[PDB]
Design a protein around this nucleic acid. Structure first.
Ligand code: DTP
Ligand code: CA
Length: 1110
DNA sequence: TAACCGCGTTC
DNA sequence: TCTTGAACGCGGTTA
C-alpha cells in the first residue's frame, strides 16, 4: 500500500542524481571469459565507488536494489545499480519434515513470497557442527524489502502460537501439524544495503569496473580518487543572552571552502560594510584565500548557496555539528521563504533528524570528534579540536557580540566566520576523510554511516562479513529478561569485575630529587636465575632474531647482573629515581586472541562433552557480581500478591515498575538494606576448537592497528635522528607523527569495542562469561607485575594494564645489542624482565587450529601476544592524595617530560568539561610548579607561593580582579544530559540554574537537551542548601530592573539594592572548594611525604592533625 | 555518616 | 529507533 511512496522517493532521487551528474549507467553486453584476470577486455566503465544507497526500481511493486555512485577515471561521475533479492531464513526443529514446512509456507506466504529453497549453513550452536554437520534452513526470497516485512508480520504470529500452550477441545484423546515445525526466523533484521554489500563483496573506496556480469575490483588501482570536497559553516543572528531560532533569526554570513579554495557570502541586509577578498592562512599547511559574494537579502544568500552547490557538484559536504544546527537552520529559513531545499540541492532529514543526500555524503566532523578523536568532552569544541589536531589557535568571538558586530565590526566578523570554515575543511581533509573512506573499504557501509554508527555496530558489521564468508548462520540479536533472580532474591544488576585499579603512593617524585628503596634480595635472586632465558627471549621473541647472530650477548649478560649485584648487597639505598610507565599493548584484544576467547568458544561441560569429550578445555575463571534486594523469594510473593490494584481510568514492563518500587521499601524495612552485592567466583570452559571467526576478526583489526602504532614509533626516531638544525625535515617528521598517532587512536575504540560488543544490547554474539574472563585474567597479569615491582621498587599507581613507578637510578635500564649485520637491537631490561614472567605464567599451550579440513585434523601449539610496552623515563610525576585517612586518589595525576613539558595530565577538573573555573585555572597554573625548588621542601614551597597567590584573591573577595575577569574565573559550567522536565524531583546546581534560566529568559531556554548551566553560588539565603543558591551568571548582564527582582527572590531578601557581583558570591563556599584542591594536590601529599603543611592558610583535617603527633 | 545519583573522566 | 564494557572522583542529596 505504501509502495508508491517508496517508488516516488527513488524517482526524485534519480532526477537529483541526474541534476548532479549521476546518470544510471547500464553496461554493454558480453558472452565470454568472466575471470577478473581479463578485466581490460570485458566491456564496461571503471570507477571509484564513493557512495551507495538502497532503492527501488521497476522493470526498466518495485524490485529492491542498491544505487552505487562512482567517480570515473576521466574526471566524470556516474551511478550504477545492482539488484539483489531480499531474503531471510526459516529454522526447523525436526529436519526430516522440512518439505512439509516448505509446502506450508509456500501456500501461506503465497501473498508475499517470490521464491524459496533449502539451503545449508554452519551453526556454531549445534552438536558435532565441527565434525562437518550443517544446519538446514528455508531461504525465503522476496521481490522487495516491503514484502519481506509482510512475511515477518505473517510468520511472527505462528512463532507466538508455537510458544503458547495449545488449547485442546477434547480432554480424553491420548501426528503434528506443519505450523508447529517453525523453529524461528533468522537473518531477518539485516539492513538491505548492508546485505547487498556483504553478499556481493562491494565496498566504498574501492575501484570497480561495472560490467553486465557485475562488479570487478580493479586491484591494479590502489590510490583513492579525489572527490569534490566542500565544508561550510553558517553565522546567525541571535537574541541577546539567548539561543538562535530559525523562526525569527536570520543567516548573516555563510563561510565555506571547496578543495583548498575559500569563499564567503554575506547578507548586506544585516552586514553593513561590504566585505572583500582577503586571506586567512592560519599555518602554511592550511592555505585559505577567500573570495566574497555580498548578496543583498537573506534569500539571495540561500539562493547563492544552492546555486554554487549545483555548480561544483560535490560528493562530500563537511560541517561541524551541521546535523543539528547548520542544516536545520538553513532548512527552515528556506522553508519560510517558500524554498524546498530537497528541490534545490537534494538534502533532507532522514528518520533520525540528520541531513543526508543521495549524491553527497554529509561528513559532520563532530561525529568523528565524539567517536574517534580520543579527545575529552572538555575539548570536543571546534576551538580545542582546531588546537589539538590542526595545531593553531583559531579566531574567537563572543556569541553575544556576533549580532552587533554586523554593524560595528563587520571585518572582525568575516574573519571569525572564515575561521570556522578553514578549521572545518582542513580538519576533514587531514583527519576525517582518509580515516572514514579507508574504513569504508572493509566495512559494508557507505561513508555517511561509517562515520556516525556506534563502534559496537561497526564491530558487528565486520563480524557479519566473516560469519557470512564462512557460511556461518547469524545468531539473532540478544534480549535480556525483564526480571532475573538469584538465591530467591530479585536481581537489580549483574555484571563482572572489571580492571584492577590501585593508588599506592601520593605526592611528588622528581628525577633531580632522591628516594629510598628497600630492595627484596630474594626478588633479585628470582631475577638473576630468570636472567638467562629472558635475555635470549629479548632477542628471540621481542626482536624475533637469533641468539647466535647477535654479537655482544655475554657482554650485556654481566653488565646487568653487575648492577643486580651492587643492588643485592646494598638492598637499602637512598638515590635518585627513574620514573617509568609500563602498559600492555591492546591488552583485552591480546588477551582474547591469546586464549581463543570468543562468545561461541564458551561452553558448559554439557555440550563440549557431547563432542570430543582433550584440549577442548582451557578452563578459565571470571568473577560474577550481582546487585539484588535482600528479600527472599517468599517476600517477593507478598509484594506480588499485594500489588494488584494500582490505578483505574497495564503492560508487563509497566507492571514491573510498581513491583520494584514497593520492593525497595519492603526490603529496606526488615533487613535495613536495599542492595546486596556478592562476588561469586565462577569458571567457564573455552573450547580451543570452535570456528574462530570472531577471535580472528579481532586479530585482524588488532594487526590493522599495530601498523599505525608501529609507524608512529618509526617516525619518532626519524625525528630523533634529524639534527635540530634542519627544520623542514623535523617539521614534516612531526606532521607524520601526528598523522599516525591519530590513526592508531581512531582504530582503538573499535578494537576495544570488540571486547565490549559481547555485552552490548542487541548483540548477536553475547557472552558475559567471555567478558569476565578477559577482565579477570588481565587483573591477574597486572597484579603479578605489581608484586614484582613492589619487591624491586615503589609502584605509584596502577590501572587495568598500566603501572606508574619509580625505580632506583641504578636498576638495569636500557641496553643496545649489536647485530652481526650492523644493526642495533633495543633492550629495556625492566620491560623485558616483566614480559618473560607473563610468558612463563600466562601462555596458551592449548591453542588448536585446523590444519586439515577434509580429515578434520587440529594441531595444538603455544600462543601469547601479551606484551608490556615501556615509556619513560620522566622528570616528574605529581600524584594527589585523598582527604580521608588511608584513602588515595586513582585515575588522576600529572607527569612531566625530561624537557619539562607536560607529559600527561589525567582525570583532573582542568581536563573535564564543566567544573569550577577557579580550580581549572588553579590546576593549570600549579602542576607546572612542582618542577621548581631545589629539594622536596623547596619544591612544595614554590607551589605554596602560587597557592597563596590564588588564596589571596578569595580572601580579598575579588578586589584584585576586574568584574569581567572575575566571573570568567568564578563560574561553574555544568551540562544537562537531558531537558529539565526529566530530572523531576532531583536537586542540583544545574537543575536550579536551568530552572532559573527559564523564568529569567523563557521556557524556550530549556527546550533542548544539553543545556550549559553557567552559574555562581550566592550567600543568601543564609543556612540553606547549595542547590538553592545557584545564580545564572547571565542575570548579571541583564537589565537592572530584571536583575534586581530576580536577585531578590533568589536571595529571599526583598529589600536588597546592592547588585554588585562581589556582594552576592559566597566566597566561603569557593574558599572551601579551592581549599580541598590545595589539600589534595599540595598540603596533604606533603604530609604523607614528611613535609610540614606548606600552605598553613589551609589546615589539615582532624585525623591528619592527630597523626603528625601520632 | 553510609548509600546513592549525575557527570565525565581512565582504563 | 538505535545501542562497546567496568572502575573511579567529586560535589551533592538521601536515609
Ligand atoms: N573505550 C573502551 N571500551 C572498552 N574497553 C576499553 C576501553 N578503553 C580501554 N578499554 C579496556 C580494554 C583495553 O585493552 C584496556 C587497557 O586500556 P588501554 O591500555 O588504554 O588500551 P589498550 O591496551 O587496548 O591499547 P594500547 O595499545 O593503546 O595500550 O582497557
Ligand atoms: Ca594498553
Amino acid at each position: 500500500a505504501l509502495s508508491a511512496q517508496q517508488l516516488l522517493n527513488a524517482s526524485k532521487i534519480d532526477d537529483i542524481d541526474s541534476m548532479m551528474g549521476f546518470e544510471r549507467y547500464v553496461p554493454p553486453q558480453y558472452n565470454g571469459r568472466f575471470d577478473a584476470k581479463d578485466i581490460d577486455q570485458i566491456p564496461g566503465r571503471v570507477g571509484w565507488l564513493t557512495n551507495m544507497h538502497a532503492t527501488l526500481v521497476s522493470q526498466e511493486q518495485g524490485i529492491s536494489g542498491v544505487d552505487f555512485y562512482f567517480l570515473d577515471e576521466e574526471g566524470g561521475s556516474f551511478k550504477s545499480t545492482v539488484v539483489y533479492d531480499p531474503y531471510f531464513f526459516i529454522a526447523c526443529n525436526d529436519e526430516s519434515r522440512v518439505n512439509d514446512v516448505e509446502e506450508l509456507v509456500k501456500k501461506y506466504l503465497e501473498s508475499c513470497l517470490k521464491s524459496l529453497q533449502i539451503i545449508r549453513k554452519e551453526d556454531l550452536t549445534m552438536d558435532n557442527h565441527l565434525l562437518g554437520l550443517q544446519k538446514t534452513l528455508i531461504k525465503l526470497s522476496f521481490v522487495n524489502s516491503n514484502q519481506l516485512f509482510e512475511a515477518r508480520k505473517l510468520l511472527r504470529p505462528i512463532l507466538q502460537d508455537n510458544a503458547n500452550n495449545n488449547v485442546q477441545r477434547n480432554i480424553y484423546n491420548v501426528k503434528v501439524d506443519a505450523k508447529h515445525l517453525i523453529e524461528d526466523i533468522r537473518e531477518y533484521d539485516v539492513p538491505y544495503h548492508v546485505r547487498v554489500s556483504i553478499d556481493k563483496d562491494i565496498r566504498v573506496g574501492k575501484w570497480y569496473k561495472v560490467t553486465q556480469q557485475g562488479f570487478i575490483e580493479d586491484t591494479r588501482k590502489i590510490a583513492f580518487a579525489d572527490p569534490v570536497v566542500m565544508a561550510f559553516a553558517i553565522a546567525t543572528t541571535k537574541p541577546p543572552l539567548k539561543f538562535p531560532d530559525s523562526a525569527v533569526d536570520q543567516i548573516m554570513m555563510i563561510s565555506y571552502m571547496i578543495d583548498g579554495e575559500g569563499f564567503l557570502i554575506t547578507n548586506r541586509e544585516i552586514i553593513s560594510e561590504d566585505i572583500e577578498d582577503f586571506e586567512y592562512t592560519p599555518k602554511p599547511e592550511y592555505p585559505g584565500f577567500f573570495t566574497i559574494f555580498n548578496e543583498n537579502d537573506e534569500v539571495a544568500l540561500l539562493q547563492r548557496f544552492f546555486e554554487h552547490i549545483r555548480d561544483v557538484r560535490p560528493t562530500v559536504i563537511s560541517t561541524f555539528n551541521g546535523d543539528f544546527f547548520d542544516w536545520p537552520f538553513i532548512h527552515n529559513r528556506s522553508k519560510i521563504h517558500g524554498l524546498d531545499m530537497f528541490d534545490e540541492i537534494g538534502f533532507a532529514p532522514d528518520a533520525e533528524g540528520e541531513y543526508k543526500s543521495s549524491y553527497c555524503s554529509h561528513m559532520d566532523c563532530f561525529r568523528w570528534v565524539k567517536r574517534d578523536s580520543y579527545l575529552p568532552q572538555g575539548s570536543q569544541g571546534l576551538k580545542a579540536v582546531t588546537q589539538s589536531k590542526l595545531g593553531y589557535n583559531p579566531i574567537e568571538l563572543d556569541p553575544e557580540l556576533m549580532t552587533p558586530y554586523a554593524f560595528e565590526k563587520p571585518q572582525h566578523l568575516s574573519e571569525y566566520s572564515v575561521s570556522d570554515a578553514v578549521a572545518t575543511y582542513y580538519l576533514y581533509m587531514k583527519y576525517v576523510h582518509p580515516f572514514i573512506f579507508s574504513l569504508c573499504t572493509i566495512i559494508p557501509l557507505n561513508p555517511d554511516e561509517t562515520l556516525r554508527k556506534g563502534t559496537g555496530t561497526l564491530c558487528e558489521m565486520l563480524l557479519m562479513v566473516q560469519a557470512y564468508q564462512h557460511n556461518i548462520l547469524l545468531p539473532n540479536k540478544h534480549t535480556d529478561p525483564i526480571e532475573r533472580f538469584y538465591d530467591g532474591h530479585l536481581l537489580e544488576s549483574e555484571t563482572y569485575v572489571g580492571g584492577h585499579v590501585e593508588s599506592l603512593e601520593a605526592g611528588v617524585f622528581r628525577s633531580d630529587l632522591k628516594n629510598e628503596f628497600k630492595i627484596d634480595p630474594s626478588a633479585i635472586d628470582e631475577l638473576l636465575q630468570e636472567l638467562p632465558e629472558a635475555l635470549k627471549f629479548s632477542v628471540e621473541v621481542e626482536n624475533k632474531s637469533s641468539v647466535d647472530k647477535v654479537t655482544n650477548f655475554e657482554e650485556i649478560k654481566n653488565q646487568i647482573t653487575q648492577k643486580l649485584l651492587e643492588l643485592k648487597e646494598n638492598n637499602i639505598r637512598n638515590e635518585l629515581p627513574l620514573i617509568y610507565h609500563v602498559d600492555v599493548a591492546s591488552m583485552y584484544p591480546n588477551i582474547m586472541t591469546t586464549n581463543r576467547l570468543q562468545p561461541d568458544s564458551i561452553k558448559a561441560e554439557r555440550d563440549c562433552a557431547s563432542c570430543d569429550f582433550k584440549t577442548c578445555a582451557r578452563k578459565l575463571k571470571w568473577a560474577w557480581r550481582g546487585e539484588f534486594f535482600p528479600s527472599k523469594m517468599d517476600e517477593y510473593n507478598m509484594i506480588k500478591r499485594a500489588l494488584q490494584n494500582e490505578t483505574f481510568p497495564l503492560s508487563y514492563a509497566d507492571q514491573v515498575i510498581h513491583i520494584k518500587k514497593r520492593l525497595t521499601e519492603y526490603s529496606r524495612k526488615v533487613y535495613h538494606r536495599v542492595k546486596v552485592s556478592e562476588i561469586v567466583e565462577r569458571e567457564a570452559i573455552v573450547c580451543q576448537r570452535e570456528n574462530p571467526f570472531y577471535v580472528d576478526t579481532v586479530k585482524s583489526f588488532r594487526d590493522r592497528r599495530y601498523e599505525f602504532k608501529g609507524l608512529a614509533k618509526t617516525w619518532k626516531g626519524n625525528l630523533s635522528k634529524i639534527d635540530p638544525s634542519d627544520k623542514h625535515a623535523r617539521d614534516e617528521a612531526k606532521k607524520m607523527i601526528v598523522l599516525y598517532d591519530s590513526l592508531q587512536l581512531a582504530h582503538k575504540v573499535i578494537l576495544v569495542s570488540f571486547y565490549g560488543y559481547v555485552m552490548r544490547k542487541g548483540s548477536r554474539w553475547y557472552s558475559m562469561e567471555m567478558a569476565g574472563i578477559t577482565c579477570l585474567t588481565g587483573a591477574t597479569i597486572i597484579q603479578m607485575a605489581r608484586a614484582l615491582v613492589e619487591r624491586v621498587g615503589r609502584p605509584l599507581e596502577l590501572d587495568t594494564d598500566g603501572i606508574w613507578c619509580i625505580l632506583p637510578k641504578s636498576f638495569p635500564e636500557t641496553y643496545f645489542f649489536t647485530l652481526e649485520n650492523g644493526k642495533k637491537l633495543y633492550l629495556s631490561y625492566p620491560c623485558s624482565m616483566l614480559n618473560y614472567r607473563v610468558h612463563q605464567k600466562f601462555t596458551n599451550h592449548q591453542y588448536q587450529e585446523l590444519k586439515d579440513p577434509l580429515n578434520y585434523i587440529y594441531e595444538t601449539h603455544s600462543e601469547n601476544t601479551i606484551f608490556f610496552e615501556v615509556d619513560g623515563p620522566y622528570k616528574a610525576m605529581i600524584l594527589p592524595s585523598s582527604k580521608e585517612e588511608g584513602k588515595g586518589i586513582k585515575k588522576r595525576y600529572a607527569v612531566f617530560n625530561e624537557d619539562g613539558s607536560l607529559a600527561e595530565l589525567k582525570g583532573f577538573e582542568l581536563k573535564r568539561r564543566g567544573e569550577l573555573q577557579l580550580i581549572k585555572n588553579f590546576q593549570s597554573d600549579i602542576f607546572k610548579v612542582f618542577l621548581e625548588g631545589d629539594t622536596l621542601e623547596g619544591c612544595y614551597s614554590a607551589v605554596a607561593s602560587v597557592c597563596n597567590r590564588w588564596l589571596d584573591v578569595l580572601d580579598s573577595h575579588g578586589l584584585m580582579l576586574e568584574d569581567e575577569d572575575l566571573v570568567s574565573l568564578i563560574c561553574e559550567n555544568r551540562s544537562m544530559s537531558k531537558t529539565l522536565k526529566e530530572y523531576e524531583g532531583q536537586k542540583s546546581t544545574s537543575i536550579t540554574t536551568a530552572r532559573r534560566l527559564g523564568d529569567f529568559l523563557g521556557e524556550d531556554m530549556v527546550k533542548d537537551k544539553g543545556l550549559q548551566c553557567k552559574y555562581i553560588i550566592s550567600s543568601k539565603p543564609f543556612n540553606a542548601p547549595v542547590t538553592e543558591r545557584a545564580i545564572p551568571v547571565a542575570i548579571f548582564s541583564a537589565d537592572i530592573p530584571i536583575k534586581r527582582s530576580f536577585l531578590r527572590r533568589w536571595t529571599l531578601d526583598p529589600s536588597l539594592e546592592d547588585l554588585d557581583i562581589r556582594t552576592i558570591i559566597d566566597w566561603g563556599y569557593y574558599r572551601e572548594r579551592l581549599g580541598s584542591a590545595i589539600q589534595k594536590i599540595i598540603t596533604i601529599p606533603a604530609a604523607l611525604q614528611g613535609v610540614s603543611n606548606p600552605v598553613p592558610r589551609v589546615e589539615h583535617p582532624d585525623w591528619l592533625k592527630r597523626k603528625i603527633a601520632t
